[PDB]
Amino acid sequence: TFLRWAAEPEHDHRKRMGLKMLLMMGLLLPLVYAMKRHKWSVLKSRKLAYRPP
Amino acid sequence: QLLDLAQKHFSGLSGTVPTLSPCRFTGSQICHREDGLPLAHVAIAVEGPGWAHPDNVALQVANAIIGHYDCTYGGGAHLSSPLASIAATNKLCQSFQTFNICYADTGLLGAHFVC
Numbered sequence A: 001t002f003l004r005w006a007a008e009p010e011h012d013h014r015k016r017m018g019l020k021m022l023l024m025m026g027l028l029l030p031l032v033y034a035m036k037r038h039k040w041s042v043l044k045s046r047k048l049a050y051r052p053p
Numbered sequence B: 001q002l003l004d005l006a007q008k009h010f011s012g013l014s015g016t017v018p019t020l021s022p023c024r025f026t027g028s029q030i031c032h033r034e035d036g037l038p039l040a041h042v043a044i045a046v047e048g049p050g051w052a053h054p055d056n057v058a059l060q061v062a063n064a065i066i067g068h069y070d071c072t073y074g075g076g077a078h079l080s081s082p083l084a085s086i087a088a089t090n091k092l093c094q095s096f097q098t099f100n101i102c103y104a105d106t107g108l109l110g111a112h113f114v115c
């Protein structure tokens, strides 16, 4: 246990950040994904019509 | 005399109900691309208030500020409307009009340009 800490003092801080990164990404990934779908909805919905005389 | 004549000729007319459903407005785009035509027409409008509303006055003031333009219009660069002076100055279009089209409880408020 001491030898792990000696090799990687950061072990605990890193793991705390990991949690906060996972949390923020849980928020931000569906959020931005939703933003994407909104803008693109104009295009996703569109219907095409060919009408030569 | 008009009223008499009305009574005389029209009184057989029936008065005995088609009333108008609200009309739902929708933000939308319709594009007929036809490259073979020589100029493009664009009409754009927001939902307006409809015949009765007192906003139509203030809206028509605003529409008049922005105005209408046609490439025969003498005013050109010196015109009062920024849209028109800029459109004349930079040959942005042949023409445009603001409109406020009024219906029962809805309308088209905007502008059409050819360019």
Ligand SMILES: CCCCCCCC/C=C/CCCCCCCC(=O)O[C@H](COC(=O)CCCCCCCCCCC)COP(=O)(O)OCCN
Pocket (backbone or CB within 6 Å): A016, A017, A020, A021, A022, A024, A025, A028
């Ligand atoms: C010009 C400005 C540049 C800014 C870039 C904008 C980033 C946009 C995307 C963000 C992704 C969302 C996930 C981030 C999780 C952040 C959570 C968090 O607070 O973590 C940070 C470390 O995280 C972190 O350090 C994680 C950050 C991950 C960002 C890496 C991408 C950018 C590369 C930077 C390289 C130069 C510190 O947490 P603690 O030490 O507990 O501090 C407590 C609060 N002050």
